Design a protein around this ligand. Structure first.
Ligand SMILES: [Zn+2]
Length: 44
């Protein structure tokens, strides 16, 4: 549960929607697409 929300002590392309770290943005770009559909938990 929201464990280690940092990665490897360095700015990475981690999905803030779920929390999946991706080497290069690209990887995350294709991953995010999967999300496109459901409604995210509006936090504010
Ligand atoms: Zn995601």
């Amino acid at each position: 549960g929201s464990s280690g929300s940092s990665g490897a002590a360095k700015t990475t392309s981690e999905c803030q929607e779920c929390g999946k770290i991706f080497r290069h943005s690209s990887l995350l770009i294709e991953h995010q697409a999967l999300h496109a559909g459901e409604s995210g938990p509006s936090s504010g």
